[PDB]
Amino acid sequence: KDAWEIPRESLRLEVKLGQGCFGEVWMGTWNGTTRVAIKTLKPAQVMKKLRHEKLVQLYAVVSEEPIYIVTEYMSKGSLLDFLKGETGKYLRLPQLVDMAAQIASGMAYVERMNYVHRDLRAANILVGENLVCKVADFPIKWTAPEAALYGRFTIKSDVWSFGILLTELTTKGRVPYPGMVNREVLDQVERGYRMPCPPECPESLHDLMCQCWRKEPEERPTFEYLQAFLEDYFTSTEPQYQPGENL
Numbered sequence: 052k053d054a055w056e057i058p059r060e061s062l063r064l065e066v067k068l069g070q071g072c073f074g075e076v077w078m079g080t081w082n083g084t085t086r087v088a089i090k091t092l093k094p095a096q097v098m099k100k101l102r103h104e105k106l107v108q109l110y111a112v113v114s115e116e117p118i119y120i121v122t123e124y125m126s127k128g129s130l131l132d133f134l135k136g137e138t139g140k141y142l143r144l145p146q147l148v149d150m151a152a153q154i155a156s157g158m159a160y161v162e163r164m165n166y167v168h169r170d171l172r173a174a175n176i177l178v179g180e181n182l183v184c185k186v187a188d189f190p191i192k193w194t195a196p197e198a199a200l201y202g203r204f205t206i207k208s209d210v211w212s213f214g215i216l217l218t219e220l221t222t223k224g225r226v227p228y229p230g231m232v233n234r235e236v237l238d239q240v241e242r243g244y245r246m247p248c249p250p251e252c253p254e255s256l257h258d259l260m261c262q263c264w265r266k267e268p269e270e271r272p273t274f275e276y277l278q279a280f281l282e283d284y285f286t287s288t289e290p291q292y293q294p295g296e297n298l
């Protein structure tokens with residue numbers, strides 16, 4: 052084994068927080084002092100080589116079935132649930148952009164570490180205290196055409212999903228391509244269809260999404276660009292922003 056292995060006895064699963072397939076997620080205490088999250092799996096790790104403030108941190112692992120993966124605890128759960136919850140209705144464009152910046156900053160690290168996530172979506176972003184967001188869990192509606200058809204997943208197919216994730220943020224959690232089943236989405240997107248600008252969303256934020264959805268993967272911006280554009284959005288791109296009714 053490796054230095055990531057711990058004894059199961061050192062773990063204390065208390066509350067169940069997630070009903071999942073091929074597993075479940077539990078909250079608990081580690082070494083009696085640390086609050087942790089434990090993901091159990093039912094009958095390799097890129098999470099060991101990756102470390103960043105905007106990626107959910109691995110703490111330890113029981114590699115003997117029952118398998119337990121111990122990670123840092125994110126107190127508000129999934130970004131999708133957070134957006135569709137009681138507070139999401141109060142999120143305005145400034146908090147939504149800042150959340151996008153944290154995800155972009157996590158993805159920039161993945162990018163310069165030369166890895167690919169393959170399933171970037173609000174469901175896989177975890178929220179913590181203080182609107183902290185972290186990427187986790189390293190689906191056609193979020194997958195780039197070349198990836199969903201030919202299995203060509205690169206950092207640039209993640210950039211595509213990042214754009215869809217922006218539509219999730221600016222709609223407060225709505226599903227992409229409303230009213231469309233998977234087959235019509237793939238058929239229309241191949242013919243050049245792109246989701247329009249969500250209501251009350253500035254055109255400059257939609258312009259960024261369209262950049263993420265360019266057919267040519269190399270023409271799509273990097274996460275480093277995306278991070279800087281969004282961190283600086285209200286000064287350099289939309290200095291005259293004014294809160295509207297629902298954003």
Ligand SMILES: O=S(=O)(Nc1ccccn1)c1ccc(/N=C/c2c(O)[nH]c3ccc4ncsc4c23)cc1
Nearest residue numbers: 067068076088107122123124125126127128129187
């Ligand atoms: O309050 S809740 O809304 N629901 C509930 C449900 C039951 C009791 C109380 N509350 C919530 C949901 C998830 C959550 N956190 C989960 C994770 C975490 O803390 N670290 C993780 C690392 C990986 C990972 N992969 C799938 S989940 C997950 C998590 C925290 C609170």
